[PDB]
mmCIF file of C-alpha atoms in Angstrom:
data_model
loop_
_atom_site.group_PDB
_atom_site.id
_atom_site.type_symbol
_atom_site.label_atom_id
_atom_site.label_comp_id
_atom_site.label_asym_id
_atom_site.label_seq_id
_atom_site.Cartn_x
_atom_site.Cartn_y
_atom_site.Cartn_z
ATOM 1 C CA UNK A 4 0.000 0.000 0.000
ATOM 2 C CA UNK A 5 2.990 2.543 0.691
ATOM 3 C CA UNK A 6 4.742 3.580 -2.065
ATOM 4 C CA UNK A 7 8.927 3.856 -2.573
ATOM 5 C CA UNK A 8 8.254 7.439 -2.008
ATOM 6 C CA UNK A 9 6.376 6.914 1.124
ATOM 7 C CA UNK A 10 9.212 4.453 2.334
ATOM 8 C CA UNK A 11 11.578 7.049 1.466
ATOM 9 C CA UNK A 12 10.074 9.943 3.783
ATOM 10 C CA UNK A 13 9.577 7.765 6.198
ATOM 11 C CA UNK A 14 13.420 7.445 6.004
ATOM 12 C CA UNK A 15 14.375 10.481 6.268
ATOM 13 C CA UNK A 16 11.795 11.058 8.868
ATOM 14 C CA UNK A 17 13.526 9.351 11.511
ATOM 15 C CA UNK A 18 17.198 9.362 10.281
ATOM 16 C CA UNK A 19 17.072 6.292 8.183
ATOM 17 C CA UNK A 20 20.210 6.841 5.643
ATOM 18 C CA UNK A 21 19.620 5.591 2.245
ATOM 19 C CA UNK A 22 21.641 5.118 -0.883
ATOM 20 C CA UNK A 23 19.456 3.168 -4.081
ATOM 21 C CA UNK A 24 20.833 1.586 -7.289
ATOM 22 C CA UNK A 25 17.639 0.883 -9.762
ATOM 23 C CA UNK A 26 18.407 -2.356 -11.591
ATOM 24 C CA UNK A 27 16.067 -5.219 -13.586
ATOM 25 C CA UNK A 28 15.610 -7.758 -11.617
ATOM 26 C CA UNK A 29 18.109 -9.913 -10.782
ATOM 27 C CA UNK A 30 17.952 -14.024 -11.549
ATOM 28 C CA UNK A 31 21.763 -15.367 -12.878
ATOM 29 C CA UNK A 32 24.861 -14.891 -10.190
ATOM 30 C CA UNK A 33 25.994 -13.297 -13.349
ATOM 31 C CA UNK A 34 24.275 -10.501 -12.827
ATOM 32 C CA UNK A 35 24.085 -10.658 -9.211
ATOM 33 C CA UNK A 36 27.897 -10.428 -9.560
ATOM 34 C CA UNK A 37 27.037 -6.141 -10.555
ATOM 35 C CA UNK A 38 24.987 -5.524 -7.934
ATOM 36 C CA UNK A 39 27.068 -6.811 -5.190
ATOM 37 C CA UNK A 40 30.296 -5.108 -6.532
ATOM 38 C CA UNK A 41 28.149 -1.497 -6.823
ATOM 39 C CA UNK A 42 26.467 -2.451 -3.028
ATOM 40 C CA UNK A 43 29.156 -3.300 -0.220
ATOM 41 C CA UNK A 44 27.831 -4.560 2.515
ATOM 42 C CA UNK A 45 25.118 -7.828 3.229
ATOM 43 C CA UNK A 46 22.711 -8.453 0.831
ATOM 44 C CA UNK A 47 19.709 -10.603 1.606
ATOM 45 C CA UNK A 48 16.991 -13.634 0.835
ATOM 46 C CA UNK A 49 13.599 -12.330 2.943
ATOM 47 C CA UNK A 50 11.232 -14.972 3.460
ATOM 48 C CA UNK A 51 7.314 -14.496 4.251
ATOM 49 C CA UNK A 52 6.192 -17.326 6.782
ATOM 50 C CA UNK A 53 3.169 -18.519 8.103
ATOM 51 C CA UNK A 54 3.239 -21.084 11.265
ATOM 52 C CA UNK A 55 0.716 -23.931 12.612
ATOM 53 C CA UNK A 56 -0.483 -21.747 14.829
ATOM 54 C CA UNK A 57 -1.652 -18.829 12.325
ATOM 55 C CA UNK A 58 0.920 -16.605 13.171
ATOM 56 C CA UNK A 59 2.745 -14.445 10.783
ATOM 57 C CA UNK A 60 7.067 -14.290 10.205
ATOM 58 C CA UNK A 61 9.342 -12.658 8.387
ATOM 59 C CA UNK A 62 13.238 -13.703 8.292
ATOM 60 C CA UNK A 63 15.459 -11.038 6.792
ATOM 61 C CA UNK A 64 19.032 -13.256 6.170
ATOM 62 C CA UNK A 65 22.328 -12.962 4.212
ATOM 63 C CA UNK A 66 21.573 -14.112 0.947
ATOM 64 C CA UNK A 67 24.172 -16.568 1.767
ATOM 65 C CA UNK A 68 22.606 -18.111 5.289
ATOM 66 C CA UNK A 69 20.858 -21.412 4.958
ATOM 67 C CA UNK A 70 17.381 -21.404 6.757
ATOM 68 C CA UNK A 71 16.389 -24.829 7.680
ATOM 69 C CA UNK A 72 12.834 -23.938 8.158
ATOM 70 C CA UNK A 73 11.887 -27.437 8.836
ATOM 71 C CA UNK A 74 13.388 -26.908 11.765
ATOM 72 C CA UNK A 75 13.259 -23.486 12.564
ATOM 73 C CA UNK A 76 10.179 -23.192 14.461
ATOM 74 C CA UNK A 77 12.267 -25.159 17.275
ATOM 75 C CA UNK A 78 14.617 -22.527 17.947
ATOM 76 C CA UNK A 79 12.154 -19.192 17.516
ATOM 77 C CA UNK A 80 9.366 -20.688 19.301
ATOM 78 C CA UNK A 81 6.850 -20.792 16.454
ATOM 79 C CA UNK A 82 4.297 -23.574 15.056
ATOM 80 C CA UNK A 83 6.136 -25.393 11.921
ATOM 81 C CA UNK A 84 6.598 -22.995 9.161
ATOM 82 C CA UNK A 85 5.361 -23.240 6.001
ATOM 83 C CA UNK A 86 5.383 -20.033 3.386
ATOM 84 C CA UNK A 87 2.881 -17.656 4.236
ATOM 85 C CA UNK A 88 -0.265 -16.946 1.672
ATOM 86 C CA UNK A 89 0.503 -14.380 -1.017
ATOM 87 C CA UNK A 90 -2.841 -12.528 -0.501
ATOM 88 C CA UNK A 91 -1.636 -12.140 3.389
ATOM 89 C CA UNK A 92 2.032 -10.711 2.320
ATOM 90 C CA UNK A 93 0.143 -8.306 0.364
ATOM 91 C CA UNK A 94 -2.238 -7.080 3.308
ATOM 92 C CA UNK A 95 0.839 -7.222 5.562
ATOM 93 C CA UNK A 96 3.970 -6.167 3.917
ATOM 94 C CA UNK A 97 2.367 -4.266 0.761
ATOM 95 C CA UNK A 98 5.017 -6.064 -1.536
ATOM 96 C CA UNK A 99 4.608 -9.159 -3.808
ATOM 97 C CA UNK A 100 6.654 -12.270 -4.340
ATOM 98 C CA UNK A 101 10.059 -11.969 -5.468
ATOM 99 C CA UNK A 102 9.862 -7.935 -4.190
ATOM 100 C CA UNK A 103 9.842 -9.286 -0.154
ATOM 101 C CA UNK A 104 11.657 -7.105 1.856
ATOM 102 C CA UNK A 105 12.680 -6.515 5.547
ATOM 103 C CA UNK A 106 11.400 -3.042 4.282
ATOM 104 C CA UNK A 107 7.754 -4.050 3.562
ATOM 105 C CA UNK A 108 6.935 -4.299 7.575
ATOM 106 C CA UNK A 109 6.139 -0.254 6.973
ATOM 107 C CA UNK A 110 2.926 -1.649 6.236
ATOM 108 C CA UNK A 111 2.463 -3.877 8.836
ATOM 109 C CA UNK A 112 0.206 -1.492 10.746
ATOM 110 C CA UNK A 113 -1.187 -3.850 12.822
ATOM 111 C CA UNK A 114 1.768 -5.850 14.156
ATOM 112 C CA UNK A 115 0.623 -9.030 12.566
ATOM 113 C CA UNK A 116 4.253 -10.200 11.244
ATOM 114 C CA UNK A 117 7.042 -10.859 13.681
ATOM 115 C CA UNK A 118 10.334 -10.581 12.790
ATOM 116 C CA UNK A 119 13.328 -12.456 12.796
ATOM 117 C CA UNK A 120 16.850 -10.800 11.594
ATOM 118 C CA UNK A 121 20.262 -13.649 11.009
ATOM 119 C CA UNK A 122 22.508 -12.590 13.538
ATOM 120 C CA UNK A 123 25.047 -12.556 10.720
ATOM 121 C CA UNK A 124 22.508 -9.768 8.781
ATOM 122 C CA UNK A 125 22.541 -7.772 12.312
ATOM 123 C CA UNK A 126 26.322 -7.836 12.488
ATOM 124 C CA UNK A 127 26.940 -6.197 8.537
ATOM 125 C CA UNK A 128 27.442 -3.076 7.273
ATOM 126 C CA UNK A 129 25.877 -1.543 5.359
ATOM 127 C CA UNK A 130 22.961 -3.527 4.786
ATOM 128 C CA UNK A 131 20.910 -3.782 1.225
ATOM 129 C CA UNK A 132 17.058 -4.875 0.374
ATOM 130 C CA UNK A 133 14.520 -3.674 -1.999
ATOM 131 C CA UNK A 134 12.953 -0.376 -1.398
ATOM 132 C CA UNK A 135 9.554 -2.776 -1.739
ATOM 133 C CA UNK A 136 10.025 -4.272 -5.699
ATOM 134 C CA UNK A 137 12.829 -6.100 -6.833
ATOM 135 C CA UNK A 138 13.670 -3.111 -10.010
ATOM 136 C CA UNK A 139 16.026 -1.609 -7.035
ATOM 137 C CA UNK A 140 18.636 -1.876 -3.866
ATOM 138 C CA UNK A 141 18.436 0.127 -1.469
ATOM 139 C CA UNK A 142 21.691 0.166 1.067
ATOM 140 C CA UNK A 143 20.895 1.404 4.756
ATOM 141 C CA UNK A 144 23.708 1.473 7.495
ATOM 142 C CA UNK A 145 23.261 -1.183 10.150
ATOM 143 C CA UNK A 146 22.017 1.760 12.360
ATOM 144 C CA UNK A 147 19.979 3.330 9.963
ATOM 145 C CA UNK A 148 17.829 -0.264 9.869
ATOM 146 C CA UNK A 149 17.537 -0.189 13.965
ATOM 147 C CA UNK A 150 16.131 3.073 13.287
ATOM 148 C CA UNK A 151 13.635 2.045 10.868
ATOM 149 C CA UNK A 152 12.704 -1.099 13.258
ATOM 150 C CA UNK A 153 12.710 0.808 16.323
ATOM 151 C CA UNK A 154 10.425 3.378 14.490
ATOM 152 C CA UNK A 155 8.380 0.982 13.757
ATOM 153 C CA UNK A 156 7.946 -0.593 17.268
ATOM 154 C CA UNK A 157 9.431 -3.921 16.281
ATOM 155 C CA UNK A 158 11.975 -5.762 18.535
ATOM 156 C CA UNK A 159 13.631 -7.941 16.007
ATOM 157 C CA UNK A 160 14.722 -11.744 17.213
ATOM 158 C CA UNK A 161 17.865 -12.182 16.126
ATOM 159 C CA UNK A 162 18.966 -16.143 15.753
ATOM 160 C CA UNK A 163 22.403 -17.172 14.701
ATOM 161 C CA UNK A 164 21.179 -19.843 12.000
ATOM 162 C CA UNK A 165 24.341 -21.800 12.099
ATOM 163 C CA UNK A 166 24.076 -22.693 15.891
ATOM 164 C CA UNK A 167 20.160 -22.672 15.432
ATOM 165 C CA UNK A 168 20.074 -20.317 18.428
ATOM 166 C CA UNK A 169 18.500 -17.230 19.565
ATOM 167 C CA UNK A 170 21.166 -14.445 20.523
#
């Protein structure tokens, strides 16, 4: 529902630094190679959950990170995971598949999507998703993304996905 514009002065609102490189979407490492060399920093896989229970997720990771969701929901407490609905990342994050972004939780007005952050995500710098559709990357320091969560009222869990752990 918010548009890049939105998510922009919403930035810049609360102190949220932001540098963007537009780009077509990105499929082949060949291209990915650009990107990464034009973005230091992490860059990241985002991935829209939805547990046994009913309860909404979002995991922002390093692209490179392995998630074993199968066993996930041992470690942040959840029902099993399974991905969530499309219609439901829509009405909760504003974005659609293959644009999912730590970013999109702008328009999760009414808390419904908790969020988990790799602990290896939380420890880069600069940081880089898409300002909420995959045609750009937006880079935000690792303190400009606290602001934006903190802004937001969200408390992010962090979990170090190699030792399965919450830290």
């Amino acid at each position: 529902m918010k548009t890049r514009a939105d998510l922009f002065a919403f930035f810049d609102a609360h102190g949220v630094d932001h540098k963007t490189l537009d780009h077509p979407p990105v499929f082949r490492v060949e291209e990915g190679l650009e990107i990464k060399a034009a973005m230091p920093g992490g860059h990241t896989k985002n991935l829209f959950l939805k547990d046994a229970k009913g309860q909404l997720w979002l995991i922002s990771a390093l692209g490179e990170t392995t998630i074993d969701l199968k066993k996930l929901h041992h470690v942040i407490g959840s029902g099993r995971l399974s991905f969530g609905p499309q219609e439901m990342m829509l009405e909760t994050l504003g974005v659609t598949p293959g644009s999912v972004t730590a970013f999109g939780l702008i328009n999760d007005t009414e808390k419904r999507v908790r969020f988990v952050l790799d602990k290896a995500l939380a420890d880069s710098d600069p940081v880089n998703f898409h300002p909420l559709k995959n045609d750009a990357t937006t880079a935000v320091s690792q303190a400009g993304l606290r602001r934006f969560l903190a802004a937001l009222g969200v408390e992010p869990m962090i979990v170090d996905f190699a030792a399965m752990e919450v830290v």
